[PDB]
Design a protein around this motif. Structure first.
Motif, short mmCIF file in Angstrom:
data_model
loop_
_atom_site.label_atom_id
_atom_site.label_comp_id
_atom_site.label_asym_id
_atom_site.label_seq_id
_atom_site.Cartn_x
_atom_site.Cartn_y
_atom_site.Cartn_z
N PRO A 163 5.12 -2.08 19.79
CA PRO A 163 4.42 -1.31 20.83
C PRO A 163 4.60 -1.87 22.23
N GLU A 164 5.43 -1.14 22.99
CA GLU A 164 5.82 -1.39 24.38
C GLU A 164 6.66 -0.20 24.84
N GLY A 165 6.67 0.09 26.14
CA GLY A 165 7.37 1.25 26.65
C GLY A 165 6.74 2.56 26.21
N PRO A 166 7.54 3.48 25.67
CA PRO A 166 6.97 4.74 25.14
C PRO A 166 6.21 4.57 23.85
N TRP A 167 6.36 3.45 23.15
CA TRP A 167 5.67 3.21 21.89
C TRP A 167 4.30 2.58 22.08
N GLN A 168 3.72 2.74 23.27
CA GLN A 168 2.40 2.22 23.60
C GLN A 168 1.33 3.32 23.60
N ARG A 169 1.63 4.48 23.04
CA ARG A 169 0.69 5.59 23.05
C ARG A 169 -0.35 5.43 21.96
N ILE A 170 -1.22 6.43 21.82
CA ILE A 170 -2.18 6.54 20.73
C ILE A 170 -2.13 7.99 20.24
N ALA A 171 -2.02 8.18 18.93
CA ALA A 171 -1.99 9.51 18.33
C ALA A 171 -3.35 10.21 18.47
N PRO A 172 -3.40 11.55 18.29
CA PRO A 172 -4.69 12.25 18.29
C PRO A 172 -5.51 12.13 17.01
N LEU A 173 -6.28 11.05 16.89
CA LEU A 173 -7.13 10.79 15.74
C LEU A 173 -8.35 11.71 15.75
N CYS A 231 -26.70 16.21 10.31
CA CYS A 231 -26.13 16.77 11.53
C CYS A 231 -24.90 15.98 11.95
N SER A 232 -23.83 16.70 12.32
CA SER A 232 -22.49 16.14 12.48
C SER A 232 -21.82 16.62 13.76
N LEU A 233 -21.11 15.70 14.41
CA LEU A 233 -20.34 15.96 15.62
C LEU A 233 -18.91 15.47 15.38
N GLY A 234 -17.91 16.22 15.85
CA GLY A 234 -16.54 15.83 15.61
C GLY A 234 -15.60 16.12 16.75
N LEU A 235 -14.68 15.19 17.03
CA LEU A 235 -13.77 15.36 18.15
C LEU A 235 -12.39 14.79 17.86
N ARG A 236 -11.39 15.32 18.56
CA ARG A 236 -10.05 14.76 18.61
C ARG A 236 -9.98 13.80 19.78
N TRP A 237 -9.28 12.69 19.60
CA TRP A 237 -9.36 11.61 20.57
C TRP A 237 -8.42 11.91 21.73
N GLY A 238 -8.96 11.86 22.94
CA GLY A 238 -8.21 12.19 24.14
C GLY A 238 -8.71 13.42 24.87
N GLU A 239 -9.54 14.22 24.23
CA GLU A 239 -10.09 15.42 24.83
C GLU A 239 -11.54 15.20 25.23
N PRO A 240 -11.92 15.61 26.44
CA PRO A 240 -13.18 15.12 27.03
C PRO A 240 -14.45 15.74 26.47
N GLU A 241 -14.36 16.68 25.55
CA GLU A 241 -15.51 17.26 24.88
C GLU A 241 -15.24 17.29 23.38
N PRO A 242 -16.28 17.39 22.55
CA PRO A 242 -16.06 17.62 21.12
C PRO A 242 -15.47 18.99 20.85
N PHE A 243 -15.11 19.21 19.59
CA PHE A 243 -14.71 20.53 19.14
C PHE A 243 -15.50 21.02 17.95
N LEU A 244 -16.31 20.18 17.31
CA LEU A 244 -17.08 20.67 16.18
C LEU A 244 -18.50 20.14 16.26
N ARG A 245 -19.45 21.00 15.88
CA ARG A 245 -20.87 20.72 16.07
C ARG A 245 -21.63 21.46 14.98
N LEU A 246 -22.02 20.77 13.92
CA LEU A 246 -22.57 21.43 12.74
C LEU A 246 -23.90 20.80 12.35
N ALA A 247 -24.80 21.62 11.82
CA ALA A 247 -26.12 21.16 11.40
C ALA A 247 -26.53 21.86 10.12
N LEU A 248 -26.85 21.09 9.08
CA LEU A 248 -27.16 21.63 7.76
C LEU A 248 -28.59 21.26 7.40
N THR A 249 -29.42 22.28 7.19
CA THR A 249 -30.86 22.13 7.03
C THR A 249 -31.25 22.58 5.63
#
Ligand SMILES: Cc1cn([C@H]2C[C@H](O)[C@@H](COP(=O)(O)OP(=O)(O)OP(=O)(O)O)O2)c(=O)[nH]c1=O
Ligand code: SF4
Ligand SMILES: [Zn+2]
Lengths: 66, 1010
Positions: free
Chosen positions: B214-224, B252-270
């Motif tokens: 990891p150096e140069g272009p190999w210093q990124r992070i994938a979208p986890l 209650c659950s929250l979920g996001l892809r890493w690098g995007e400034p807001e979540p994308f999933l928001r679920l609540a099971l009652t």
DNA sequence: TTAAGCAATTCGTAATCATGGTCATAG
DNA sequence: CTATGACCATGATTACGAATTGC
């Protein structure tokens, strides 16, 4: 009894009669009747066949330091 | 819910695979190609598909010297070492090892420890089939039988017994969170019929992979993909929840892809029917089995990379697992990635002198990674309370009621769900704001350990890993020395102070990275330590070796280069790059989190040196440690002699300077001038002058000018901080004093900070005396909040607290009647206050929980707080500016103010009324006394300006809860014990209740029925 | 099988010594 | 009834062991 204690607990959390955790139960019943929102004539008819008992004539959280 | 994108058109005979790995795994396997341990590697592509990789053909090994006989240089005895002894008495020596392909290999290598020469020697390389067979072989080659045709007479020791995955990663140069490549034609996707649940499943041999550094272009992070969740349970009154009686009612659950400034999933099971929430999905079930099944199916389908939360390890997951076991739902505990594996609860403990001791449960998830944010806070940060409310205020700024918000209506349940979703959202914000995960990825790339080891282990596996990775490049093997136990050695010097108060500027000069540069620039290592005899009978002393103050001899760098200089040089460049990045930020919290990153890299470099002296460890060499601290002592006394000797009255300068203090890396020299510009100029000249008497990278540097200065003892001082001159002043410095420790009250730390503010910034001792007088007076008159009275102490290991009776141990071990299921455990902090009683022999008999003294209203011991908490820190601080008439001045400022105090049979009060003017009890209810009746208009005037100021305090507090709660139309329910708002809003009701009734002694100001 | 280091200031807690005060006995 | 002696305790001071922070 044990069925009259759930009717009052149901009257105490219905939002269309007011935000009531500071006052008595019969005062909130008469407040809604003045404005005449729709108080039901059964939460009155258990507050008359009892004396001053603190588990009928008191709000749910009349303990609880809030 | 939302699925990963579809892997379209990968053809293995033309296309490669490029993916980034997260977890590795060991696996003992059938379906061999026509070894048994095969390796798993889980990862993600540069787009977002999930990849499992099966790696084949790798087996553990170690090394052992070939003994000087006719055996291990003869091939018959090599294969006879492979061959088993067929005798009846060799059942203890050829069964538990048995027929395994250990094999025989000859190689020419060397041992690490010491310096014998540049010449190697023959060693035997012994493979083993399984990793769980190196332990009985070690129990059968050293203390077992090695009579086998007289080839290897006992004993020859084992060298380089290390961990399997670490040996794999040291072999192939793969590090934590690395970019891995399968070339074209090397991997087969459909060779593995699907046993896991990922999208791409490759099946590769262990020599085909390519690792990208990891150096140069190999210093990124994938979208986890990151998940956070939280649960709710419905309990009884008093009784803390128990997994065999209390249902789980909301997840209650929250979920996001890493690098995007807001979540994308928001679920609540009652668990009852609910009301809709804008921005989230809501589903409802009539039974808990459907709720647990629905959550397990969602967690399979979304398939997250990382799982976070707050106290999910020790509360949430084992509650879910036990609750699923009780209700007979068979399909719940399969949460992992492997399709046929169920999960299990398992205890573990960790202990060190750096973080203390903590006992945690773990729950097994293969493929996925866990990050409880509570454990990250408890490991890195030293705070006062570790509640979610307390750390959310410190970093951002904020059970029996719930059971009736759930047995009610559906808008109450909607309120409960919005509360639960805010709870489940807070640790995501903390994870992205504190730069946790970026620093974890950089730590795993600089050290070379996996991403699960930075939450479970200490600082030894990392230095073992880096030393092995530097050892393969010159051909050395590590030995196994273990000793219980050596003695201590002598640590660091402190210079004797000239105690007091200074008002002429003192300049601070210190060395930067002291011990790693000592280890660098005098060529100290394991691999170049010269034994006392091997210098003889060679006589070449000059520029071949050196001598240390403890006494050793060490070879010059014209013969060898050590291994610890190179590891230290890599760590030093990484920290230098982190500081070079930190020198261009403007935001304050961002500036301190980059300071946290560089602090972590400096701690790593110093723990390299601390590895050597740990006699309970894996490889200790206390000779090196003694040489280090001897060089430290020699250099600091060199600094003090040089600084006080050169700049003097006879040498053309103004005044002969005099050193007032020095603590093992720094020197605080007092120059004489009272102009900060001239002190800064001479101090920079002194630092740069003295640095030219050393090897490199040894350098002394100017750091600050204190003006004025306050020196109390060793490791206790204070001052005011100058960075530049036209940057006038920065802040105070409080090293060691009563404002940074956590063993005291907030009242005392606040008083010490305010006294040093009024005393060092404004230089007015009279306002300081008046301030301390008002604090003591308001203490004795009983108008001090109980937030300022709470003391906290850490509940450590139970036997040291068995050895002697303490206060917090007594409070913790005394359960409550309400709850024998929620109580302090080992490692946490217990808060308490001290109430007044007549048992003067024991301050451990007067301690009580803050909530219990809240609900039960016990009085406070104002004399305990006056003479034991407050008085002696004040006598530390206030004396050195004056004499002992200053002790009498503050004990007389007490004396004018100590004479104002406010406070079975106690129930039989007659409500004895009293005159408002002269305090004479008398019959009748009128407020005024007959002798003091003329002055009644003035006595009414007095105290209505008190009612007026209590009215103004009621309203500012009880409407602040409405804005902290969110709503203006519904009730407040927040009994947050870490908020000053709570129980400060409780006492003003009673002050107003009392002060309103005192004015009804006077009549009414008019009628009211007209 | 698993764990960086040491120097301490500092205050609390416990033990020992000193000093007086109260009670009992004798003149 | 008064004075003297003995005992007993109680309080204060000094010395040692332990949570946290400085390096
Ligand atoms: C803080 C700390 C210091 N030390 C030793 C090593 C250090 O060389 C010596 C000096 O302490 P520090 O001044 O705290 O650290 P440093 O001089 O190495 O780095 P910098 O000046 O940039 O802040 O004290 C340890 O051994 N372990 C530690 O945790
Ligand atoms: S008591 Fe009021 S101000 Fe304090 S935390 Fe609770 S709601 Fe917020
Ligand atoms: Zn009067």
């Amino acid at each position: 009894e044990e069925a009259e204690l759930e009717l009052l607990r149901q009257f105490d959390l219905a939002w269309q009669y007011g935000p009531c955790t500071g006052i008595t139960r019969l005062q909130r019943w008469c407040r809604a009747k003045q404005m005449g929102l729709e108080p039901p004539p059964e939460v009155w008819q258990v507050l008359k066949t009892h004396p001053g008992d603190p588990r009928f004539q008191c709000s749910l959280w009349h303990l609880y330091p809030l | 819910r939302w699925l990963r994108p579809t892997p379209p058109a990968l053809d293995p005979q033309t296309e490669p695979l490029i993916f980034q790995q997260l977890e590795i795994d060991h696996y003992v396997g059938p379906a061999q190609p026509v070894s048994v341990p095969v390796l798993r590697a889980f990862g993600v592509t540069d787009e977002g598909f999930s990849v499992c990789c099966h790696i084949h053909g790798f087996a553990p090994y170690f090394y052992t010297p070939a003994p000087p006989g006719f055996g291990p240089e003869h091939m018959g005895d090599l294969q006879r070492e492979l061959n088993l002894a067929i005798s009846r008495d060799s059942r203890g020596g050829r069964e538990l090892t048995g027929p395994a392909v250990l094999a025989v290999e000859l190689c020419s290598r060397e041992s690490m420890f010491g310096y014998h020469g540049h010449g190697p020697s023959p060693f035997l390389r012994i493979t083993v089939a399984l990793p769980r067979l190196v332990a009985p072989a070690r129990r059968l080659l050293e203390q077992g039988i090695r009579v086998a045709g007289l080839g290897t007479p006992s004993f020859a020791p084992y060298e380089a017994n290390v961990d399997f995955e670490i040996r794999f990663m040291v072999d192939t140069d793969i590090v934590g969170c690395n970019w891995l490549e399968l070339p074209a034609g090397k991997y087969a996707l459909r060779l593995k019929e699907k046993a896991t649940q990922c999208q791409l499943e490759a099946d590769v041999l262990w020599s085909d992979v390519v690792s990208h550094p990891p150096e140069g272009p190999w210093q990124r992070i994938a979208p986890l993909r990151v998940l956070s969740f939280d649960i709710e349970c419905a309990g009884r009154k008093g009784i803390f929840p128990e997994p065999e009686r209390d249902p789980v009612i909301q997840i209650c659950s929250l979920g996001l892809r890493w690098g995007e400034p807001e979540p994308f999933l928001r679920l609540a099971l009652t668990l009852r029917p609910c009301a809709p929430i804008l921005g989230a999905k809501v589903q409802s079930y009539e039974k808990e089995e459907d709720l647990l099944q629905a959550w397990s199916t969602f967690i399979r389908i979304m398939d997250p990379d990382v799982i976070t939360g707050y106290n999910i390890q020790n509360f949430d997951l084992p509650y879910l697992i036990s609750r699923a076991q009780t209700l007979k739902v068979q399909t719940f505990p399969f949460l992992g990635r492997v399709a046929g594996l169920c999960s299990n609860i398992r205890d573990s403990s960790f202990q060190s002198k750096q973080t203390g001791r903590r006992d945690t449960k773990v729950v097994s998830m293969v493929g996925r990674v866990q990050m409880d944010m509570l454990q990250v806070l408890l490991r890195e940060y030293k705070l006062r309370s570790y509640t979610l409310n307390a750390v959310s205020f410190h970093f951002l700024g904020e059970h029996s009621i719930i059971t009736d918000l759930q047995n009610g209506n559906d808008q109450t349940r909607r309120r409960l769900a919005v509360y639960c979703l805010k709870d489940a959202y807070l640790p995501l914000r903390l994870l992205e704001r504190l730069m946790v995960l970026v620093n974890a990825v950089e730590m795993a790339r600089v050290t070379g350990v996996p991403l699960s080891y930075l939450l479970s282990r200490g600082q030894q596996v990392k230095v073992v890993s880096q030393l092995l990775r530097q050892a393969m490049h010159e051909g050395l093997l590590m030995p196994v020395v273990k000793s219980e136990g050596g003695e201590d050695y002598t640590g660091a010097t402190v210079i004797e102070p000239l105690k007091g108060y200074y008002d002429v500027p003192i300049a601070t000069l210190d060395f930067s990275s002291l011990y790693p540069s000592i280890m660098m620039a005098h060529n100290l290592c394991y691999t170049t330590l010269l034994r006392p005899g091997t210098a003889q009978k060679l006589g070449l002393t000059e520029d071949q070796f050196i001598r240390t103050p403890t006494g050793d001899e060490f070879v010059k760098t014209s013969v060898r280069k050590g291994l610890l200089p190179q590891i230290l040089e890599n760590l030093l460049s990484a920290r230098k790059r982190a500081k070079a990045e930190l020198a261009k930020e403007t935001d304050p919290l961002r500036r301190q989190v980059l300071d946290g990153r560089q602090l972590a890299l400096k701690v790593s470099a110093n723990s390299v040196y601390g590895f050597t002296g740990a006699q309970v460890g894996k490889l200790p060499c206390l000779e090196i440690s003694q040489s280090v601290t001897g060089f430290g002592r020699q250099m600091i006394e060199k600094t003090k002699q040089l600084v006080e000797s050169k700049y003097t009255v006879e040498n053309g300068y103004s005044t002969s300077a005099k050193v007032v203090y020095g603590d093992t890396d720094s020197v605080m020299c007092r120059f004489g001038v009272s102009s900060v510009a001239e002190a800064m100029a001479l101090g920079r000249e002194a630092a740069d002058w003295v640095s030219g008497h050393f090897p490199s990278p040894i350098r002394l540097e100017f750091e600050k000018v204190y003006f004025p200065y306050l020196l109390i003892s060793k490791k206790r001082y204070a001052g005011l901080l100058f960075s530049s001159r036209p940057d006038a002043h920065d802040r105070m410095d409080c090293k060691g004093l009563e404002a940074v420790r956590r063993d005291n009250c907030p009242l005392v730390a606040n008083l010490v900070t305010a006294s040093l503010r009024r005393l060092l910034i404004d230089r007015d001792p009279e306002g300081a005396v008046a301030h301390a007088q008002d604090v003591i007076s308001d203490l004795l008159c009983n108008r001090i909040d109980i937030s300022q009275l709470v003391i906290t102490k850490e509940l450590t290991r139970a036997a040291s607290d068995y050895a002697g009776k303490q206060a917090h141990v007594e409070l913790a071990e005394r359960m409550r009647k309400r709850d024998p299921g929620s109580a302090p455990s080992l490692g946490d902090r217990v808060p308490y206050v001290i109430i007044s009683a007549a048992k003067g022999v024991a301050a451990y008999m007067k301690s009580e929980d803050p909530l219990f003294v809240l609900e039960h209203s016990l009085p406070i011991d104002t004399q305990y707080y006056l003479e034991q908490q407050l008085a002696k820190p004040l006598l530390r601080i206030f004396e050195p500016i004056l004499g002992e008439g200053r002790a009498e001045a503050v004990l007389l400022r007490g004396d004018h103010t100590r004479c104002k105090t406010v406070l079975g049979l106690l129930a039989f009060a007659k409500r004895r009324n009293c005159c408002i003017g002269c305090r004479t009890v008398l019959s009748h209810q009128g407020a005024v006394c007959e002798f003091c009746q003329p002055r009644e208009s003035e006595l009414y005037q007095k105290e209505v300006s008190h009612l007026n100021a209590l009215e103004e305090r009621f309203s500012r507090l009880w409407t602040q809860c409405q804005r902290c709660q969110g709503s203006l139309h519904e009730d407040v329910i927040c009994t947050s014990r870490d908020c000053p708002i709570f129980y400060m809003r409780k006492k003003v009701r009673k002050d107003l209740e009392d002060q309103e009734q005192l004015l009804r002694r006077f009549g009414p100001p008019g009628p009211e029925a007209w």
